[PDB]
């Protein structure tokens, strides 16, 4: 029904929000510290000097283990 189409769109948008903002292909699993923005995969976070969202200096990257993780790279 039309409701099935609406629910498919909501599911897809929530899953898109869990992907890396730089490569768009891998799940987010890294945090820029100390600002706390958690918007990249490990590969893309590794080479940023400043946060891509707030411009704060990245002192280090903290790996995050999230219950929503489903990609083979995070399991």
- Interface with a copy of itself (CB under 8 A): 1, 3-4, 7-8, 10-11, 14-15, 17-18, 21, 28, 31, 33-39, 53, 62-68
Choose, by CB under 6 A, the member of 6, 7, 14, 24 that binds ligand JHP: 24
Cα–Cα distances (Å) from 61 to 2, 3, 14, 24, 36, in that order, read 43, 41, 24, 19, 9
Can residue 16 be called a binding residue for ligand JHP (CB under 6 A)?
Answer: yes
Cβ neighbours of 73 (radius 10 Å): 11
**Is 9 a residue that touches ligand JHP (CB under 6 A)?**
no
């Amino acid at each position: 029904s039309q409701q099935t189409r609406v629910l498919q769109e909501k599911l897809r948008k929530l899953k898109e929000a869990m992907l890396c903002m730089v490569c768009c292909e891998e799940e987010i699993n890294s945090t820029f510290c100390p600002c706390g923005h958690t918007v990249c995969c490990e590969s893309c976070a590794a080479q940023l000097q400043s946060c891509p969202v707030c411009r704060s200096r990245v002192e280090h990257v903290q790996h995050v283990y999230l219950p929503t993780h489903t990609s083979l790279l995070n399991l």
